[PDB]
Ligand binder design. Structure first.
Ligand SMILES: Nc1ncnc2c1ncn2[C@@H]1O[C@H](COP(=O)(O)OP(=O)(O)OP(=O)(O)O)[C@@H](O)[C@H]1O
Ligand SMILES: Nc1ncnc2c1ncn2[C@@H]1O[C@H](COP(=O)(O)OP(=O)(O)OP(=O)(O)O)[C@@H](O)[C@H]1O
Ligand SMILES: Nc1ncnc2c1ncn2[C@@H]1O[C@H](COP(=O)(O)OP(=O)(O)OP(=O)(O)O)[C@@H](O)[C@H]1O
Lengths: 112, 416, 433, 416
């Protein structure tokens, strides 16, 4: 659920920052560590994630762009074709994703 | 007491209603106030627009959208109220209370009481407009929650110089109708009309698009000589009208989807602009036609699969939509959701339709299909395929099974 | 410039935070008001012990009387009563004790400048000496199947406390004497008071007269205001009188009418404007229609052509179904079929778009959010936090199955559509089967 | 100001369990004098005199200890409905016996060690009263078990007295392990008869009936023995009070409360006529108290409901008749109200009532699918407990059921 997702994301962010639990940590990140924050969310397996939770969590992260010191990047791992995602996510989220997206094939069977 | 009113278009009645119920004197304002309207109705816009014209009103802004559950919502109230009171009246000696100590609403009331007692030395009674945006948008939500904030300030001592004046914003109507007997002052936001949406988009997102880098290229590339800002404004404005009239029956009356469509199609429409395209937007329409013929909200031989996998997925669809009665006769409800089946049926049908025995590659392809989620199971956590309780169903529509049958030269069209 | 004084005076009287010398008690309430006041004065002035529950719906002026009585008695017996307030919604069965402990100390500080907890409270009162006053809202919440130890102790303290003790309860249930357990019910004094309901139009007219009149010369226009108010309450054909009669007939919670009136006074800019508005009384119609703007008809009037057509097609499938269930596939099939029929009835010429199934997804998403549809067994907003916990732990099948096969049920039946949908609409002819 | 007491003040301000007192004392004396340990069980309905009799027995046993007929003993009183948590019983009992302040786990083990292991000659006899014992029941019932179990230890020198709701509770709810230990030592209290209630009232008012007073003519202050006044209460008033209460419940408090209520009514009659020679409390004063106990406000409140609520209940009753069912969906009722309006639609004022119900009497409002304040009255009937509604977010398939009896609803509809 979104409650666990935000908590775990902030936990990992805090662990990395202290190696050198909510959106306030993102808000106060620069006033704590003096450096800008860039996040890379790597979705390791999209086809098995409950698309409702992911769809809501993307909208939750959408609020983070109010801060001038934060930048976000999302990586999607897809086993099936790209269009399998389009059926399950809501068309509001697809329009968020489509504004800045890149498409890459990493299969080993690329043209023999 | 008198409060000035901003001229918010298509919200004049609600701006007058917020001129009501909101004033400097806490004796002329209610304990609770609710503004209601579905998403894309302007409530968050209008409320901030009204507060931005009257700075003397002490407003505190919070968003349950970020605050996942009720504990963050409680703690943020204390934190932001304390910080705002320090920001407004700093000279009074006060002692800090930790906002993380607010674990219960009673503790919130206690902390608010203590803070107001610390400010008791104030000369005049003043309002404190705590604002919550999208109360029902809270994700960990239940019906009993809202009464706790309805009936809150009466537990505060009325002698205090600082009085809290809650303001709420809500989306759903099924949330309001559980609290109609309380007679809480309510201000309503209806969905905009098409004539309103088009003008709102023209007023808002015109100048932002008008001076983007994409046009900064094309103007010089086409060597436009007599261009003025008015021509820019008209050319940009025509785009919004065209997109609205093209996709109104598709988006509806929502500003967000129209903005996203404009964002996607604006560079491509700008690309078609030539020397002869401006001052005749009809030609612009007659050249960028294919932009207005497809939504282009899509994110992008569709499935490339092994032959064994293809025939397994044919047999699974047969299992999922053919009644079990016919397995003994044919081989020897599309609109409905697929029925469940067993692997024993799938293996038999696959053996009966492939142009194979039980080598490991068949089961490997089946497990690959499950991992690809082209076939679903009756479980969510701790998948235990080998347990007999699990059942199987197809997660692929007919339009893809038809193409698979064509690619393997199979005749599913004759079995139904 | 001076009009603002009277305009603010009217609002200040309307909200009801008047000084005790200026406050108003409506005539039909006075019997129960005196019944409550006698007990309160007996407990505070004459040191009696009592326990009372007030009954009546929400917004029935039930607590206003207690507030008035305490504000009155604070003038003459400021040093002789202690007030304890507890609310059922905010205070749980745990947090009530801490609330009592904090409020007792808070009162004692400004005065001076559970086997043993209650006994030690009584001993502290004895060593510091004052009548202890208990006020409870939402008694039924405390009187639930959860153990009622709080009220059990409070009603037991009535006839055993060495310090005068008084308890007032507030709730809307009528079966209070069955809510309370037989142990607690026995200990309660059972002097139940039911708040007097408005039972005549004369009661409501007099309530309006009491509420809106001005009894002092705050403004030179006070005499004009009182006279105009009485004139409008007098003539049966007054617009304001008609609206008051409609209110009385429809619902008999006076604070609803108060809240309806508040914008009319607030918006007024001049005395002439106020008089014209209160005579015409047209803005209550605007307020009422805005109260109705987000109802089913208001939402339905805002939909688009394609959205309306898909709604009609979904309604047709729901009507034909035995259980009323339908899904996206059937809805799109019917949409295609009706588009084909409309095209066919247009003759072909010798030598209307069927939107693609992918584009219709946005229309479906729009309609699912605007609550025209609903999932087959959608419980919706849960009642309590524990129910929300169990709901969020579970994963419903309807959220996992594909977008094209989720089962829905309809909120606006096709007959209601034919009532509402204008006949000038192209798709209106399909509002019949 | 002086506390003014009228002539009725003493009546408001102000022997039936001797056999039960003797039975409890006989068992207690036998066990205490023999330096033994046992469990005593007490049960009965509220207000019959269980706790008061036990306190009398304990006080007289202390009197026996003062007379040194029996050795010294320590008394501990615990009420199950006064504990914050069930675990506090172990801490409280050890705190009183030893003065220590250990945790519940340590105290429970300390009590187990104390009663079982400590020699008898190194102890003081302990008597414990567990009031509201059935309210101490936990999931494991250890409080029901452990305290009685320690009484089986011959070295304990412990006497435990428990008060519960029912006599056969160990058989109904406890195990055979606890039930056998409790055994035959159980005593039951039965509610008083009417003559006993009359006798108790007379005993409480032994020195006040037919007594003379000196009453200040200027303030009403009365002094028991300025003018001479006499007071009386009708014997028939007491009889009708005693007979009515004894036919309702055995609770002695109700009979005392009725006399206080009757005296308060007589006090109001005295004050009203005087406006501040024998004042006889009349049977009308008692019957007034009996009337308010018996009469229910449900019917009159229904008759005082607004028109829309009565129409709702009438339509629901009509559907109950036409369908023979107990609950009706809002899909039924919303259009059944329309049917009931339409059947009479040939009348002129039906047009006006329809304009009120469906457009609120204004031309600017279009047709509504609900009558005005449908939600308001629907919630109000649920708020008052009249109506029962099941949770479902569909506004048509949601079911509605009456909570009140049918016949009183019919009577309320008839009186309109
Ligand atoms: N009268 C108006 N004039 C111009 N723009 C408007 C007007 N009303 C709304 N908008 C636009 O609506 C956009 C969406 O914000 P809005 O206040 O409608 O959100 P919302 O309905 O509160 O959203 P949510 O429910 O997601 O919190 C704003 O960016 C604003 O530009
Ligand atoms: N201190 C006050 N000053 C002015 N008006 C008040 C005050 N307290 C309550 N009211 C009035 O009380 C009316 C609503 O009734 P009230 O507040 O007495 O009920 P309640 O305690 O909320 O009811 P219940 O517990 O039965 O739900 C409102 O119209 C409000 O104006
Ligand atoms: N025989 C009696 N004579 C006088 N007063 C009595 C008698 N019996 C009971 N009472 C009164 O009843 C009150 C309650 O009695 P007691 O504490 O024994 O209650 P109970 O029977 O155990 O019931 P509950 O469970 O409601 O406490 C006493 O305070 C006393 O004033």
């Amino acid at each position: 659920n979104v409650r666990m997702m935000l908590r775990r994301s902030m936990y990992k962010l805090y662990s990395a920052a202290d190696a050198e639990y909510d959106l306030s940590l993102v808000e106060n990140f620069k006033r704590l560590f003096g450096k800008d924050l860039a996040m890379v969310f790597n979705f390791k397996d999209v086809d098995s994630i409950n698309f409702n939770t992911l769809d809501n969590f993307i909208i939750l992260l959408k609020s983070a762009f109010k801060y001038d010191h934060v930048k976000i990047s999302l990586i999607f791992n897809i086993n099936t074709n790209l269009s399998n995602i389009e059926k399950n996510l809501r068309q509001s989220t697809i329009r968020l994703l489509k504004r800045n997206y890149h498409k890459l094939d990493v299969s080993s069977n690329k043209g023999f | 007491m008198n409060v000035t009113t901003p001229e918010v278009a298509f919200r004049e009645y609600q701006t007058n209603c917020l001129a009501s119920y909101i004033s400097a004197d806490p004796d002329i304002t209610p304990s609770n106030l609710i503004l209601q309207g579905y998403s894309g109705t302007g409530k968050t816009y209008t409320l901030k627009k009204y507060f931005n014209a009257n700075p003397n009103l002490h407003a505190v802004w919070l968003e349950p959208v970020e605050l996942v559950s009720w504990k963050p919502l409680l703690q943020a109230i204390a934190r932001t109220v304390q910080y705002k009171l320090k920001t407004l009246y700093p000279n009074i000696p006060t002692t800090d209370y930790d906002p993380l100590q607010v674990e219960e609403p009673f503790l919130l009331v206690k902390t608010l009481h203590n803070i107001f007692v610390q400010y008791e030395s104030l000369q005049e009674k003043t309002c404190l407009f705590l604002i919550l945006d999208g109360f029902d948008s809270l994700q960990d939500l239940d019906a009993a929650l809202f009464n706790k904030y309805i009936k809150l300030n009466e537990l505060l001592p009325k002698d205090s110089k600082i009085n809290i004046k809650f303001i709420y914003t809500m989306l759903e109507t099924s949330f309001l109708q559980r609290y109609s007997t309380h007679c809480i002052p309510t201000v309503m936001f209806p969905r905009y009309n098409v004539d309103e949406v088009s003008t709102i988009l023209v007023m808002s997102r015109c100048g932002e698009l008008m001076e983007d880098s994409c046009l900064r290229k094309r103007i010089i590339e086409e060597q436009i000589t007599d261009c003025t800002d008015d021509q820019f404004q008209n050319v940009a404005a025509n785009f919004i009208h065209l997109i609205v009239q093209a996709f109104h029956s598709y988006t509806g009356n929502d500003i967000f989807a129209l903005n996203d469509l404009i964002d996607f199609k604006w560079p491509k429409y700008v690309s078609r602009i030539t020397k002869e395209n401006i001052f005749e937007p009809l030609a612009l329409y007659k050249s960028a036609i294919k932009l207005f013929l497809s939504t282009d909200d899509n994110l992008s031989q569709t499935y490339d699969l092994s032959i064994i996998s293809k025939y397994l997925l044919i047999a699974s669809y047969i299992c999922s939509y053919l009644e079990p009665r016919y397995d003994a006769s044919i081989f020897s409800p599309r609109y409905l959701q697929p029925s469940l089946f067993a692997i024993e049926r799938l293996l038999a049908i696959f053996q009966a339709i492939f142009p194979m025995k039980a080598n490991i590659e068949v089961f490997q392809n089946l497990s690959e299909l499950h991992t690809l989620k082209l076939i679903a199971t009756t479980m969510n956590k701790n998948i235990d395929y080998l347990s007999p309780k699990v059942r199987w169903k197809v997660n692929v529509p007919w339009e893809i099974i038809k193409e698979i049958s064509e690619s393997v030269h199979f005749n599913i069209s004759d079995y139904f | 410039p001076g009009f603002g004084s009277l305009q603010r005076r009217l609002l200040q009287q309307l909200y009801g935070t008047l000084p005790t010398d200026e406050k108003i008690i409506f005539t039909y309430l006075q019997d129960c008001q005196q019944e409550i006041d006698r007990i309160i004065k007996q407990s505070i002035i004459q040191k009696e012990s009592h326990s009372v529950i007030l009954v009546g719906p929400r917004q029935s002026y039930k607590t206003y009387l207690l507030d008035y009585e305490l504000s009155l008695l604070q003038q003459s017996y400021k040093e002789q009563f202690i007030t304890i307030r507890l609310n059922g919604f905010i205070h749980s069965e745990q947090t009530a004790i801490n609330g009592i402990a904090t409020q007792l100390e808070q009162q004692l500080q400004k005065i001076h400048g559970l086997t043993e907890v209650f006994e030690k409270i009584l001993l502290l009162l004895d060593s510091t000496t004052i009548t202890v006053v208990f006020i409870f809202d939402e008694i039924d919440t405390f009187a639930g199947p959860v153990r009622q130890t709080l009220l059990y102790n409070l009603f037991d303290m009535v006839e055993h406390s060495r310090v005068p003790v008084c308890i007032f309860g507030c709730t809307t249930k009528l079966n209070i004497l069955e809510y309370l357990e037989k142990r607690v019910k026995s200990r309660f004094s059972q002097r139940v008071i039911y708040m007097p309901q408005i039972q005549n139009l004369d009661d409501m007219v007099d309530a309006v007269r009491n509420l809106l009149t001005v009894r002092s010369e705050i403004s030179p226009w006070v005499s004009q205001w009182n006279e105009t108010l009485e004139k409008e309450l007098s003539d049966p054909r007054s617009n304001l009188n008609r609206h008051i009669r409609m209110n009385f007939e429809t619902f008999r919670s006076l604070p609803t009418l108060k809240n309806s009136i508040i914008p009319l006074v607030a918006t007024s800019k001049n005395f002439g404007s106020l008089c014209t508005a209160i005579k015409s009384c047209s803005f209550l119609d605007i307020y009422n229609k805005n109260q109705l703007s987000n109802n089913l008809t208001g939402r339905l009037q805002s939909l688009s052509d394609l959205e309306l057509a898909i709604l009609i097609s979904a309604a047709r499938v729901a009507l034909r179904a035995k259980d009323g269930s339908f899904n996206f596939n059937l809805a799109y099939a019917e949409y295609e079929k009706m588009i084909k029929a409309i095209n066919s009835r247009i003759p072909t010429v010798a030598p209307i778009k069927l939107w693609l199934k992918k584009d219709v997804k946005n229309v479906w998403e729009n309609l699912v959010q605007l609550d025209f549809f609903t999932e087959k067994s959608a419980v919706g907003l849960r009642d309590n936090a524990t129910a929300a916990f169990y709901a969020s732990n579970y994963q419903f099948q309807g959220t996992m199955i594909p977008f094209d096969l989720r089962s829905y049920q309809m909120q606006i039946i096709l007959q209601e559509l034919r009532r509402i949908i204008p006949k000038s609409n192209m798709y209106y002819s399909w509002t019949q089967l | 100001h002086q506390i003014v007491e009228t002539i009725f003040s003493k009546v408001k301000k102000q022997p039936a369990r001797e056999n039960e007192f003797a039975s409890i004392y006989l068992s207690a004396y036998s066990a205490i004098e023999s330096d033994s340990a046992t469990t005593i069980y007490v049960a009965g309905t509220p207000g019959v005199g269980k706790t008061l009799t036990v306190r009398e027995v304990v006080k007289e046993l202390l009197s026996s200890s003062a007379q040194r007929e029996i050795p010294d003993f320590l008394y501990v009183e615990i009420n199950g409905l006064k504990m914050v948590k069930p675990t506090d019983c172990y801490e409280t009992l050890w705190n009183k016996v030893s003065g220590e302040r250990l945790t519940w786990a340590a105290s429970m083990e300390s009590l187990e060690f104390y009663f079982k292991r400590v020699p008898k000659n190194k102890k003081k006899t302990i008597v414990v009263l567990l009031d509201e014992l059935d309210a101490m029941v936990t999931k494991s019932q250890d409080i029901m078990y452990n305290f009685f179990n320690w009484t089986t230890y011959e070295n304990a020198k412990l006497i435990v007295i428990a008060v519960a709701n029912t006599m056969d509770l160990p058989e109904r709810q406890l195990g055979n392990k606890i039930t056998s230990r409790i055994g035959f030592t159980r005593i039951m209290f039965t509610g008083y008869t009417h003559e006993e209630l009359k006798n108790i009232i007379d005993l409480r008012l032994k020195g006040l009936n037919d007594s003379f007073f000196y009453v200040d003519t200027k303030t009403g202050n009365a002094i028991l023995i300025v003018r001479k006044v006499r007071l009386r209460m009708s014997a028939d008033a007491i009889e009708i009070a005693s007979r009515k209460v004894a036919s309702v419940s055995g609770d002695a408090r109700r009979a005392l409360k009725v006399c206080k209520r009757a005296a308060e009514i007589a006090e109001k009659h005295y004050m009203a006529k005087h406006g501040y020679g024998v004042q006889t409390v009349h049977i009308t004063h008692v019957m007034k108290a009996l009337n308010e106990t018996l009469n229910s406000h449900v019917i009159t409140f229904m008759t005082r409901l607004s028109f829309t609520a009565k129409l709702f209940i009438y339509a629901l009753l009509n559907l109950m008749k036409k369908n023979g069912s107990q609950e009706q969906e809002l899909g039924d009722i919303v259009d059944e109200i329309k049917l009931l309006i339409e059947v009479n639609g040939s009348n002129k004022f039906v047009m006006e009532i329809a304009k009120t119900l469906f457009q609120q009497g204004s031309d600017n409002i279009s047709e509504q699918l609900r009558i005005i304040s449908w939600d308001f009255v629907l919630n109000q009937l649920l708020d008052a407990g009249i109506l029962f509604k099941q949770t479902m977010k569909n506004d048509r398939i949601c079911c509605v059921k009456l909570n009140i009896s049918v016949e009183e609803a019919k009577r309320a509809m008839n009186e309109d």
